Swiss-Prot record, chain A:
The gene is rplI. Pfam families: Ribosomal_L9_C (PF03948), Ribosomal_L9_N (PF01281). This is Large ribosomal subunit protein bL9. It comes from Mycoplasma pneumoniae (strain ATCC 29342 / M129 / Subtype 1). GO terms for cellular component: ribonucleoprotein complex; ribosome. Binds to the 23S rRNA.
Curated annotation (Swiss-Prot), chain B:
It comes from the Bacteria. Keywords: Ribonucleoprotein, Ribosomal protein, RNA-binding, rRNA-binding. Part of the 50S ribosomal subunit. Forms a bridge to the 30S subunit in the 70S ribosome. It comes from Mycoplasma pneumoniae (strain ATCC 29342 / M129 / Subtype 1). SMART domains: Ribosomal_L2, Ribosomal_L2_C. Gene3D superfamilies: 2.30.30.30, Nucleic acid-binding proteins, Ribosomal protein L2, domain 3. One of its GO terms (cellular component) is large ribosomal subunit. SUPFAM superfamilies: Nucleic acid-binding proteins, Translation proteins SH3-like domain. One of its GO terms (molecular function) is rRNA binding. One of the primary rRNA binding proteins. Required for association of the 30S and 50S subunits to form the 70S ribosome, for tRNA binding and peptide bond formation. It has been suggested to have peptidyltransferase activity; this is somewhat controversial. Makes several contacts with the 16S rRNA in the 70S ribosome. InterPro entries: NA-bd_OB-fold, Rib_uL2_dom2, Ribosomal_uL2, Ribosomal_uL2_bac/org-type, Ribosomal_uL2_C, Ribosomal_uL2_CS, Ribosomal_uL2_dom3, Ribosomal_uL2_RNA-bd_dom. It holds the Pfam family Ribosomal_L2. Residues 221-265 are annotated as: Disordered. This is Large ribosomal subunit protein uL2.
Curated annotation (Swiss-Prot), chain C:
GO terms for biological process: translation. The gene is rpmB. GO terms for cellular component: ribonucleoprotein complex; ribosome. Belongs to the bacterial ribosomal protein bL28 family. GO terms for molecular function: structural constituent of ribosome. Signal peptide: none annotated. This is Large ribosomal subunit protein bL28. Pfam families: Ribosomal_L28 (PF00830). Keywords: Ribonucleoprotein, Ribosomal protein. Residues 1-20 are annotated as: Disordered.
Amino acid sequence: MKVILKQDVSNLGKRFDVVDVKDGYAIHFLFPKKLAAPLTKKSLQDRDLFLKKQQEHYEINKALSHKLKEVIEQTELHFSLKEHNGRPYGSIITKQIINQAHTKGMALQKFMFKDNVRLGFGDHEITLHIFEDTTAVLKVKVTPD
Amino acid sequence: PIKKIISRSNSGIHHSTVIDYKKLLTTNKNKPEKSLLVTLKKHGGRNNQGKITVRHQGGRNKRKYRIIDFKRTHYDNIEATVKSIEYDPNRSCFVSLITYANGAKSYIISPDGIKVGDKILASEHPIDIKPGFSMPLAFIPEGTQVHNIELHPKGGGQIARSAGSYARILGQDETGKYVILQLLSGETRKFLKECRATVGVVSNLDHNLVVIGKAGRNRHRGIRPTVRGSAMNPNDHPHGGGEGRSPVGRDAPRTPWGKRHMGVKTRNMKKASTNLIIRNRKGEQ
Amino acid sequence: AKKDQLTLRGPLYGNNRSHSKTITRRKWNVNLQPCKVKTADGKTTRILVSTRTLRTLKKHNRL
RNA sequence: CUACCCUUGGUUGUGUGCUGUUCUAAUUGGUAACUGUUAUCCAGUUUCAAGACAGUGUUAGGUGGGCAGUUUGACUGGGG
RNA sequence: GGACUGUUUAACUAAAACACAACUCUAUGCCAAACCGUAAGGUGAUGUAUAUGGGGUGACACCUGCCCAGUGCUGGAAGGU
RNA sequence: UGGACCUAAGCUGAGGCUGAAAAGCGUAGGCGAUGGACAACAGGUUAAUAUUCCUGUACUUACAGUUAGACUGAUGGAGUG
RNA sequence: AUGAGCAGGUUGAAGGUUGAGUAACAUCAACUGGAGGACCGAACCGACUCUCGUUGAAACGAUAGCGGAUGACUUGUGAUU
RNA sequence: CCUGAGUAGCUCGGAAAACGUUAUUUUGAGUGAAUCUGCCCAGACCAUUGGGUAAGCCUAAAUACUAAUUAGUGACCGAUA
């Protein structure tokens, strides 16, 4: 059981703070967006240290969200689909985007997307939410071979 | 068509029937095409260590399995030309050798009403309405006959792949899946519209007409003679034994094991396939 | 074997009883729960954990 | 007039379960794709399908000679 | 009597017994029912209901009559528990 | 004739999985003729050997140098086996 | 899974061609046919029987038969429960 | 600041303790404290009081035995032992 909230306001009316639902496994260990620190050290010595850590984390989250929003504006994706003259014969998933991100060396996780399988060709622009802070906007060119 | 032959044997008579096999097929001698055959071995009811698991299996003759394409998604949108209808000794149905329009051949299932030289297609798009064509079930109107339906999406045709098998179309569900089909078992199942199948009834509906005629013909298929439960020893299977025939024992007699075999429901409702049932041939759902 | 790598513990070996106290050798197996291990190795996998040990590691924040 | 306690109508709402939702995010897969690999074993990612179900363990129900161990008196002009 | 040809208690008893084609009833939709071990797992089966399994009958043609009172099997909402 | 060639149902089994252990499932491999391609005949010889000792009658595939031409193509796939 | 065997002789079916016949049939005739849990019958499998032996020549035999003896075949090699 | 945390304990079935499960140890399952002021122990428990502060590790000595190297002894036997 963990009793520390992290990375956001947890989808309900509350302040982004320590208080959490009385489960410890509600979404905590199933969400990479739920982190914490050992409660043994977080009795009284870690109060201000974790307050400043939370503030610094909020600042860097804003900064890196903006930096990634700027980066995706120049790393427009390019893909292909083998189709019967445009008739559906291929599949579009997040997996190829994950593989190209892998090759680039940077990391894109599951929580940076909300889709399971997609479709479409040509040049098209997409907008996927990441948090209440920012929202990623990208462009992709899929060639319908 | 089944027919009898006057054998003039001096050991009783026989009611065995054999199908002509030549007003429907050709090449009664084994003349297959290489690189598309796999030799199969029989198990005779034995396990991987040689212990019995199935009863009265044995005596089957050697049979070379034909490499059939069941998933059929390896190469799509290429039109195939039917070249032959070959007997399949591995199953009650027959295989069909077709030739693609790119320079390859394959084996498929043989539905009833097909001819040599016809052209077929297996694609994920709507295609010509001919027995044999395969397309997503959402594109098929009601009132047709379908066979060789897969349960796994892109898994391969497993359900309803014996001779004289079919499925009655019973509409489609809102969720884009769970198409209702009346199967040739008394059941009614909601399959996945993502799953595909080969339309048309399986060939050889006359399989109900062939007569084995003698124990010998049955043994060579792979079915061995087995003793009735009453004649078993009072210790091997306690329904009888000793001198004189005796009436069967307790109500709802037993198998070699303690299970019933007349009215026991051996299927449980603790699987995901339970939600896929509409009619259970003993009531509803 | 029916045991997790953290503590290689199998079933506990006892004697079953009844209303008439019938002697019967018996074993109570462990309630092993399978979960993914969160650590830095190169690729995470799924291992079995004892629930009491799971509570210990969660209360010490062992991921 | 104000007050102790109610039956009875709405009433506010906490603390738990009964089902009807939705999702996957744990979990399962003898779905498929990629990789080790070359290897229908196995493992990792994705996918597909469910999904807090199932399954497992704990405790107990119901069936349960499939299987185990038991019990099966005496006198009796043999014995029953 | 057994349709038949056939298996059978080695070294007392070969067949009205068993088997048997076929008939019939029933369970079983895939990771099938089921079976094996405990479990992975394997067979059924590298099979898909016209198939497997079990019970009954056991050339051939015709019939198999009264019955669910108790038990088995299935379905079950009322009430007690 | 059997191996230095390969495979048969099958066995073992690097790793991996299951199970207190032992041990089982189980992949690559590695085994597995009772099969598959696989190059010599006759006659004479001893108390005891013969397609093996000896006489004539054909050679074989590898390996080189040598002579001339020529580019060869598998580990992959096909035919064949 | 890899192989072998069934001496010899009967036997004239289904099937297809032709003709008579018939509108076409049926019914018949000649031709390929050697099919047939077909037959007789060597070797072979078994013991259904008579006799002999019964501390036998043999811990199950000799014996003359017998049914099968192209298939519900037998046997061989190795594994197999 | 600290002196061994899912710790002592509580609940469902047990195992060891003379005990067939009770003071005491552990748990297959679930829950779950505390801080020397406090905690545990004092064959249920509790008040006072007494002892010790568990919940990390290790150790020769007194522990049995001879496959034996050797020396010695047999109210040990003497080829049926």
